[PDB]
Amino acid sequence: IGVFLRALLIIIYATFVGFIFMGIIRKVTARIHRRIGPPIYQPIIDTLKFFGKKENITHGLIYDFGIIYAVGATILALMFIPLGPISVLRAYGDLILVTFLLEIPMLGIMFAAMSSGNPYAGIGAQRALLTLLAIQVPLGLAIIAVAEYYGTFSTYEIVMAQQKMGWSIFHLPLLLAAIAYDIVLQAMFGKEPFDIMIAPGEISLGPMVEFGGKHMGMLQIQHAMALFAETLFFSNIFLGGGVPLLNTLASLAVLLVKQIAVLLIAIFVGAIFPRFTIDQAAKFYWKWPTIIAAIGAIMAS
């Protein structure tokens, strides 16, 4: 009953900071090309609008359950990564679990985008799945480079091995995995260079081309959690937060600073770079970040 309230604390904090992180993305992309743009508390009002309609669509019996499964999977992703010391479980937060549970949101946001039935949703799913094909070639090598440099997989036995000694973006056989993660994060998010699972403008909107009221609200929740989960997975592995309430709140605050830190370098790349053809997106994630992560993988062994 206490782990239930603690998990409710983590999911409601991840909501009320992940939406603010997406609003920070909107604010920085507004200032990146000379505009005030929205207030900081903007996508909260997006979600609050999208649950206030009076009609919906519901094309099929599976059209509901796919995106609801996407929200359940993206909540399951953030439940294992150690959000500060307050973790509902730290015994098993293994690398392969969190790495695969980022991809399952890219199922359910697309598995229920297929049930509508559209050439726009079909070619959006066509251009979304080649990413998830191509991005796992430098992603797996980054995970092996994290693996063989430490040995342990329980993610509480990694932040302990960071706060004992050293940082983790240092020690160059592990830094070459971080550049591979810094490039794969824009694809795993849906930011502008490797945008194409969102693609606003070239195709209509790809997978989320016609969802409706409540379904777009669940998508905004899922997209904010995908943001927060992949950013917390990058920070609790390659950066390490680790660490009384005046110690715990400051621990979560410096964790939030390192959340913004990779999120800050995810935006500066992700506005000055145009959208990528999916035929080149399959060709790019095998040339440069694969050989970088492969040099990191043979230098971690």
Partner: protein, 603 residues
């Protein structure tokens, strides 16, 4: 006594269901002829802890020591349950009486290879299995069938060559004692033994040199048969490589020096396995057909087992057999569900059907378990199996081989998205209004494999604790729900309940009313335009044209072309030796006699 009856029982079931074609009883008494091996295996399951069960039956002057070990029972148990789950789905989709003679002979081949503790029971059962599978796929498209037969006879008979050499060099034939004498010389003729044994079991696996029978024999056939053609008839290659490890591991590691912390013969078979997962997944993409897509799926997951049962002497077999059980258990369900969708509807090609997931929700839900059972979903056995295979990679460090198997999980994810799109979602064409639901006898097999999958996935667990103890003293300290690896945990209780809690909290944010009005499909976006029923809007043509045009250089070098080249060369040499040696010239044969007499002069 209680051991040989289960080897004759599918043979007797193939025998009995040939004469009894008088009534509608060839289904009923035919299917329970293959349903007694589960009842006999589980009756002898508690006697495995006792000193082992064997039998001799000296026939043909040989030994035929059948004996059931701790792990041969495990493969035989999945042999019974997968061979059941196909065969009670085989009571339909036959349209003849000449089906049950071979599809039950194949299961007696399958129980024979697994319960093979000698070799003269091993190769006999393997040859029976090869014949039964061939004669099953020998009903139409002969060129597809005979290619499988020539390749698998080459594998069977190269195994006969390898057993000839290991019977010559040792002297004795018996398989239990031949591991002892390999321990005896564990402290130049054996690099041929391993390679010929690997070719002997590269014919019933997905090995990238020799897998060209797979997109033809897993292709056009009785599809309800095929759930054992990948679910037990490709586990025989896995059990072959595992029996190779039971024969020697250290004697093959001294004569072949390790390239890294992994042994080099294990590294070679796992590198060919990693290439297998790559090519199997990639060729599963641009494969517009309902079964030729699934051929590459069935040989995609074999490379997982041959990576895990490659590198690593602890936990490597202990993780690869786990994925072997998991993959065969759901791929039986996938071939069952594709047989259902190929029987209830008409034609085969992807440009026949789409959006067929509302006229048969039992099919949709049962293979929604199987979609969850593939590519990694934490309540199901797919994620447990892939996670064990990825756990065996990092121990005895291998960075170059971990990339292709992880890429294999990605491309395992990709093709299933390609399957569930243009077969199940979108609009339906106007020839599928004359269709019904799923019939009951396939649905019993679907439900059996689904409940076995859900007890396999949420808690490993029972089979992990089974294969842990009494075999290669414990690498994993598992319990009923957790797994307890040396440096990982993988709970299954508090990983599935956080899903079903997270789905409740997700349903709280959705199940709120405020108008959930249903709409038709024919009125849709289409860039804000009118769209009628006669518009092919769901895409159904190759689905992966940038994926094909990315590696358009890699696909110009196929192996289907090379083997047809080498067989046409042998076949035109067959027309060559026919006309040269065998002339009408009488004096040519006189000259042949004078030549061999001249050799007798030369002594």
């Amino acid at each position: 006594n209680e051991l040989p009856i289960i080897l004759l029982s599918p043979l007797i079931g193939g025998a009995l269901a040939w004469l009894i074609r008088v009534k509608g009883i060839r289904e009923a008494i035919g299917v329970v002829s293959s349903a007694i091996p589960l009842y006999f295996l589980i009756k002898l399951y508690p006697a495995l802890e006792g000193e082992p069960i064997r039998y001799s039956l000296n026939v043909g002057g040989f030994e035929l020591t059948l004996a059931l070990s701790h792990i041969s029972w495990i493969f035989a148990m999945i042999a019974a349950v997968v061979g059941l789950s196909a065969v009670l789905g085989l009571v339909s989709t036959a349209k003849d009486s000449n089906e049950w003679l071979f599809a039950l002979m194949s299961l007696a081949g399958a129980l024979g290879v697994f319960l093979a503790n000698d070799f003269v029971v091993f190769f006999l059962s393997w040859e029976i299995m090869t014949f039964a599978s061939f004669m099953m796929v020998f009903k139409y498209n002969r060129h597809a069938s005979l290619k499988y037969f020539v390749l698998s006879i080459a594998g069977a008979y190269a195994m006969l060559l390898a057993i000839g050499i290991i019977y010559a060099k040792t002297g004795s034939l018996s398989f239990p004692e031949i591991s002892a004498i390999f321990r005896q010389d564990a402290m130049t003729e054996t690099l041929l033994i391993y390679a010929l044994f690997l070719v002997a079991f590269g014919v019933k696996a997905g090995m990238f040199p020799l897998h060209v029978w797979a997109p033809d024999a897993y292709s056009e056939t009785n599809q309800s048969y095929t759930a054992m053609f990948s679910g037990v008839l490709s586990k025989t290659g896995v059990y072959g490589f595992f029996l190779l490890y039971l024969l020697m591991y250290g004697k093959l590691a001294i004569t072949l020096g390790n390239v890294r912390s992994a042994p080099t013969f294990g590294y070679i078979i796992a590198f060919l396995g990693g290439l297998t997962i790559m090519v199997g997944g990639i060729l599963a993409a641009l494969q517009e057909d309902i079964r030729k897509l699934f051929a590459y799926s069935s040989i995609s997951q074999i490379g997982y087992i041959l990576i895990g049962l490659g590198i690593g002497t602890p936990l490597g077999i202990a993780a690869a057999t786990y994925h072997a059980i998991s993959h065969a258990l759901f791929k039986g369900l996938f071939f069952l569900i594709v047989a259902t969708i190929i029987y209830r509807t008409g034609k085969t090609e992807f440009k026949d059907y789409g959006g067929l997931a509302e006229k048969m929700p039992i099919t949709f839900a049962m293979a929604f378990v199987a979609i969850l059972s593939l590519a990694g979903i934490p309540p199901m056995a797919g994620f447990a199996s892939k996670w064990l295979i990825f756990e065996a990679v990092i121990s005895r460090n291998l960075p170059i081989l971990g990339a292709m198997v992880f890429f294999g999980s990605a491309i395992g994810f990709v093709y299933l998205i390609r399957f569930t799109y243009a077969v199940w979602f979108g609009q339906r064409p106007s020839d599928l209004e004359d269709v019904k639901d799923a019939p009951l006898p396939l649905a019993i097999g679907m439900g059996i494999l689904a409940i076995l999958n859900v007890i396999f996935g949420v808690a490993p667990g029972l089979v992990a604790r089974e294969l842990n103890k009494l075999f290669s003293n414990p690498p994993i300290g598992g319990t009923i729900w957790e797994l307890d690896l040396g440096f990982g945990r993988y709970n299954g209780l508090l990983l599935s309940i956080w899903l079903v809690i997270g789905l409740i909290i997700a349903a709280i944010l959705y199940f709120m009313g405020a108008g959930v009005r249903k709409v038709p499909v024919t009125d849709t976006y289409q860039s804000g335009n009118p769209v009628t029923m006669e518009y092919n809007l769901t895409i159904r043509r190759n689905f992966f044209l940038p994926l094909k045009e990315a590696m358009a250089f890699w696909l110009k070098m196929s192996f289907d072309r090379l083997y047809h080249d080498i067989w046409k060369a042998i076949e035109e040499l067959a027309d060559l030796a026919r006309s040269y040696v065998y002339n009408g010239n009488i004096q040519a044969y006189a000259w042949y006699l004078a030549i061999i007499l001249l050799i007798l002069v030369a002594m």
